[PDB]
Design a protein. Structure first.
Ligand SMILES: [Mg+2]
Ligand SMILES: [Mg+2]
Ligand SMILES: [Zn+2]
Ligand SMILES: [Zn+2]
Lengths: 595, 25, 593, 24
């Protein structure tokens, strides 16, 4: 018996555990699964469970008539926490005859469980009540005869509260006839009280289920609200895609796609005129809207929009929403994103690196290059680590680059923005793989780690007697292509070092200002002394530190690319020029320290 | 009939200095 | 014995349940709580648990060397899914003496638990292993001597895999020598296997904790990104508070706040002109930026910006952020928000309702009135109910009005936007309560329910001959003030019915267009027949419906308010005019049929 | 040394008219 009741108890625990750990569901669904799965271990001819209404406070418009005195105050049963005893749902598990599961939403007081006050008294008090010979009790008007014309008569009742950890009651479980006809004993009280304590702890899983559904709905709303704020409005599209002003349609893009292609190809600037091919390209004369138009031109110039039938309006709006996704930070704004995308296009075309890449590798490479620092907050990964920003808890390593990948994929998920509509599933999988390969490549660390592998590839290819052998040797293995891609993304990310001195000068002042603002945040909020790179007081130390940046980081990748392709020779040459300039400034600072 | 209250009670050694200096790690 | 076996099992289950349901925590924390709470019911001299790394796939930069052949392919132990056997953490509970507990992140192979291959083999295959006289077996090469400086020696090993629902192995719970000299029998096998199955189902709670933390981080990131997109940029602020172009000051605001008040009070439209005090106000000749300047002026005009010393730049940023929070939908855009806020200001000032409410109450009313339909998607609650939008799953009834409340309180929660920063707590609760009341009162079902209570108030108030008695009677009881509040909010949201016919015709066309786009969506994506009000095919029936809308809804509000205050008498009069105009359009249609 | 496999409200007039205006 003792062994039997303990094995029964533990299997109650195990099946209720299994059914709450099958999936997160609401109170009704979890107790339905747990109770129905424990139907064989609850030795009851019937039992039921009424869940109380959980609205502890009421809305002000329902409290108005009481405070106004138009309606008399509710006098009568109240839960110990002070709520009204209102059962919003009952689930009856009839098992003595035909097994049936009657769900009664909003049971009236006519319900055969509620005609007696005992659930109401348990909600009023939270007492565990065992009652025998129901017709003999005078205080509770339990039925003396058949209750549902089936000859089933209530003989014993065991009513228990289910209690949330706050001591607020959530429901009343009423266990009826004991089968054996004996009254409830302390052993069966022990079994039922164990069940009800487990159910009260299992209320945590419903709590969480509601919490996460609220968090999910709030996240989806916040993402859709962000998508509304971020997506280009149709006016922002019309500012580029001037279909109205020339096709005279003015209402809908009902014109054929060839008309949009013509109207865009005439509106986008020529890449020869705006230096979009050269390494020496500078974005300072252009406005950011002109950078959007140049980026759409760059997608045209690789001859991929026409080949895969990329819709012109979709491309234009994905390039405008990409521009809007960058923050207004001092250096990691949209301008740096476009400079990386233009450097990528220059590597593909002028660097002659396209020989190793198909057109669905250049298309994805350029689309990933434009998005590699989208929504940059203005702080390195160290600030994320130290401040413990939600990014640093969401993304463990390469925090911002993973954020930029996740956001670029979220932009591509919307059909209204997806430039990859008319691709096959396997082509879309390829493009997504190369999106990850190109966006997570941009962290400098990974670059430092994989310099050796890229060097081994370039050294092996330098010995090759003919171009065709080197191209075949690269294109046979996917991994060698991925390494070349990652180092192309890193070389584009650092490309400002290779720009002429005027550009390098200004852009380095912008980088230094962003790092000084980051270090002012570190000093003010974290109460830490910043690194001298991030200390404003070491402004005069900036030029010599910049020299240390040139000969440690960039010069390797640009020497390896200049060995790999002769057409990338001038890019390193600009880096060398910039090294000389900063070195002269460091010597002037040395003269300041010399006196 | 019994009524009861509820029971409830990698990197090189030299590279590490430069990597820390530029905030890479 | 068997009773003691099941009492141990049931106790183990109950205390592991108690400690997983104490707090949603990580796998390490949940197994620490469970195992350490069940430390007595294990009845082992010592045991340890090692969790395997969950990285099923390697990152591509860690898989490049394998494909390039720079590093030889890993050969040896592998889990049945194919993950590498890499114990990332051990938690050792020393129960034989001193009751010590240690945590070893990244245990070396030198670690005495990993010295023998038995956890590694259990990760390789997921078998349950019972091992008698462990140092005597030659395969796993257990420690023959003392394990450590203490004279503790391994005699039996009971290694079990924890299984995720995908049949991946998550950890190895290595229960060492039994407290008694007996080997592990099948009864202890059954107890430990029950424990490990419960722990493998509590992996649901760990997975839900990790998912929930990722969801919370993603939500907070999405809200902060939304806040950046929504908050007025410094140039958007400077487009109104032109401190740079007049005060000759740099980007840093070091000006006196009184000087910013002086420089703004010259840059805001005069409230006597542009009929900001009149019911006949029309926003059509004003751009949204002019409406922002007007709304800042209206906050000045109740004389609250100076009395509570709220900053001017915060107020300007809040107004512009509210403008940006409205979408560009056909009718429930920022124009509707500002028309409701202007109607609120006119009810306070011209309607003389201000004598019932304090300064702070009027300030709360005007701020709630501006935000009452912020971020409206253009579809009524019916579409949210039918399409099962995330709003309808989040907010049960009055879905959009609760959304507009929640978003405007989120806007006030940012300190750079909080006009109520310089007010004391109990005042913050008062203003938040009035904000909630005012915004939720814009659901028409609530208004319909409370019409009778408002009429009973007005009928009671008409019986007193003097204004002082009426103000004493109303202002004593908070609830009567809240009913006047709700009916003021409803009378402002529907104010377009009271506007002159030129305004009313265009606004009614805008409402009809938004309802036709609503019906288009319900037909196209839901395959339901639209209601004739939302059916574009019944465009010609539009004027008749307007007559019903006048005959059923608004006329009660403006009758009760024209009774209640003679000053609001013209507002109902405009409604009556508009009805006559719609009658001239309805019976002509009966002449066209 | 034994190895085993792992075990596994409104009035009636309101109730009519509010449907046409979509107030419910
Ligand atoms: Mg970056
Ligand atoms: Mg509304
Ligand atoms: Zn970058
Ligand atoms: Zn409204």
């Amino acid at each position: 018996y003792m062994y039997n009741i303990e094995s029964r108890r533990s299997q109650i625990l195990m099946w209720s555990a299994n059914k709450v750990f099958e999936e997160l569901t609401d109170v009704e669904r979890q107790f339905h699964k747990a109770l129905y799965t424990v139907r064989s271990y609850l030795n009851c001819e019937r039992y039921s469970i009424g869940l109380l209404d959980m609205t502890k406070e009421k809305e002000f418009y329902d409290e108005w008539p009481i405070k106004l005195g138009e309606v008399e105050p509710y006098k009568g049963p109240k839960t110990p926490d002070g709520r009204e005893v209102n059962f919003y749902k009952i689930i009856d598990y009839i098992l003595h005859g035909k097994e049936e599961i009657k769900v009664i939403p909003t049971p009236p007081a006519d319900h055969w469980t509620l005609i007696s006050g005992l659930p109401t008294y348990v909600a009023e008090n939270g007492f565990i009540c065992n009652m025998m010979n129901a017709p003999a009790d005078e205080y509770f008007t339990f039925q003396k005869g058949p209750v549902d014309e089936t000859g089933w008569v209530i003989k014993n009742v065991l009513s228990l509260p289910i209690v949330n950890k706050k001591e607020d009651i959530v429901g009343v479980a009423t266990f009826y006839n004991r089968k054996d006809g004996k009254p409830f004993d302390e052993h069966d009280e022990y079994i039922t009280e164990t069940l009800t304590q487990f159910l009260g702890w299992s209320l945590l899983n419903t709590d969480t289920y509601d919490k996460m559904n609220k968090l999910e709905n709030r996240k989806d709303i916040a993402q859709e609200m962000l998508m509304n704020q971020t997506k280009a409005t149709p006016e922002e599209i019309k500012s580029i895609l001037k279909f109205q002003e020339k096709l005279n349609v003015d209402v809908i893009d009902d014109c054929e796609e060839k008309q949009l292609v013509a109207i865009l190809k005439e509106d986008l600037p020529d890449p020869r005129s705006a230096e979009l091919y050269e390494f020496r390209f500078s974005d300072f004369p252009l406005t950011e809207h002109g950078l959007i138009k140049c980026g759409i031109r760059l997608f045209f110039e690789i001859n991929v929009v026409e080949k895969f039938k990329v819709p012109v309006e979709v491309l234009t709006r994905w390039m405008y929403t990409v521009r809007k996704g960058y923050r207004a930070v001092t250096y990691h704004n949209w301008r740096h994103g476009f400079n990386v995308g233009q450097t990528m296009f220059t590597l593909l075309m002028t660097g002659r690196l396209k020989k190793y890449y198909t057109d669905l590798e250049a298309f994805a490479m350029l689309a990933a290059a434009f998005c590699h620092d989208i929504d940059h907050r203005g702080t390195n990964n160290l600030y994320q680590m130290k401040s413990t920003s939600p990014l640093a808890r969401l993304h463990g390593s390469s925090i911002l680059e993973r954020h930029h990948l996740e956001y670029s994929k979220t932009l591509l998920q919307d059909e209204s923005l997806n430039i990859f509509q008319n691709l096959n599933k396997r082509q879309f999988e390829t493009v997504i793989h190369l999106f990850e390969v190109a966006i997570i490549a941009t962290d400098l660390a990974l670059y430092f780690k994989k310099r050796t592998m890229f060097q081994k590839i370039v050294d092996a290819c330098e010995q090759m007697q003919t171009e065709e052998e080197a191209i075949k040797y690269v294109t046979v293995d996917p991994t060698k292509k991925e390494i070349i891609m990652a180092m192309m993304m890193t070389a584009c990310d650092l490309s400002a070092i290779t720009k002429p001195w005027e550009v390098q000068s200004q852009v380095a002042l912008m980088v230094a200002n962003e790092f000084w603002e980051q270090g002012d945040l570190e000093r003010t909020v974290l109460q830490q002394q910043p690194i001298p790179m991030m200390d404003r007081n070491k402004r005069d130390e900036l030029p010599k530190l910049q020299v240390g940046f040139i000969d440690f980081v960039c010069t390797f990748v640009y020497k390896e690319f200049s060995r790999f392709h002769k057409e990338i020779t001038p890019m390193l040459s600009g880096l060398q020029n910039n090294r000389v300039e900063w070195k002269s400034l460091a010597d002037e600072y040395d003269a300041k320290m010399k006196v | 009939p019994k009524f009861k209250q509820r029971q409830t009670r990698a990197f090189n050694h030299l590279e590490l200095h430069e990597l820390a200096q530029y905030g890479i790690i």
